[PDB]
């Protein structure tokens, strides 16, 4: 990570404030409300007249 945060394969003596390269998100979650109801698209787009 120290090599990457300053972009070099050779790192000399000292202290270095590295960037964030350790943790990568691996799981995705989705939370949507309980609706389970469709629009009247068939009652609107298939109307007798507009």
């Amino acid at each position: 990570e120290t090599k990457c945060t300053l972009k070099s394969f050779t790192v000399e003596k000292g202290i270095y404030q590295t960037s964030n390269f350790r943790v990568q998100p691996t799981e995705s979650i989705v939370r949507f409300p309980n609706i389970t109801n469709l629009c009247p698209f068939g009652e609107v787009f298939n109307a007798t007249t507009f």
């Binding site: 790192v11 000292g14 202290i15 404030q17």
Partner: protein, 197 residues
């Protein structure tokens, strides 16, 4: 509303119609779960306080880690060691659990000596790569984290009646370097930001 982070239960107070709450500068940090109506809290999946102390690649491969302003009890919680590689988890806990006033310093052992500072670390503490391998039995050259030597202590013996006078002087020649100029440069208008076109 999508985003990356770490969720956690929280005691935040939300208005009945409110759905999310932002940070100081337009950063949604506490969302409300729609399926349970309970309040969650989003913390960034990034803790930037990690300072790596190295003796140089062409001197060794061991390194020390300094997490900023944390105890050595929350470091696996802070950096999420459970989601990290085993090599990183080695630098999370262990035997070298030295704690300083600028976060603790897993990776390097602490000594009671007062050697002169080699690599500054934080408030008072320094570190150095020492060839203790001969001193510490069969172990290897290692990184140590001492406290700085404040020069050397001395006594004057005032005594309220005493004069001190030199008898033999020592002419000394000292070198002091000072930069007086820097390499002047010039830049072309078009040939840099447009080349030739």
């Amino acid at each position: 509303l999508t985003g990356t982070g770490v969720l956690t239960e929280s005691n935040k107070k939300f208005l009945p119609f409110q759905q999310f709450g932002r940070d100081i500068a337009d950063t949604t940090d506490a969302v409300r779960d729609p399926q349970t109506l309970e309040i969650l809290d989003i913390t960034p999946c990034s803790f930037g306080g990690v300072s790596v102390i190295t003796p140089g690649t062409n001197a060794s491969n061991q390194v020390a880690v300094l997490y900023q302003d944390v105890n050595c009890t929350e470091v696996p919680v802070a950096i999420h060691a459970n989601q990290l590689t085993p090599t990183w988890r080695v630098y999370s806990t262990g035997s070298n659990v030295f704690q300083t006033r600028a976060g603790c310093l897993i990776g390097a052992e602490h000594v009671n000596n007062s050697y002169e500072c080699d690599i500054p670390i934080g408030a008072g503490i320094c570190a150095s790569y020492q060839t203790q391998t001969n001193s510490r039995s069969v172990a290897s050259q290692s990184i140590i984290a001492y406290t700085m030597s404040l020069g050397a202590e001395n006594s004057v013996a005032y005594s309220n009646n005493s004069i001190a006078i030199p008898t033999n002087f020592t002419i000394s020649v000292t070198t002091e370097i000072l930069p007086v100029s820097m390499t002047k440069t010039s830049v072309d208008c078009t040939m840099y930001i447009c080349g030739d076109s």
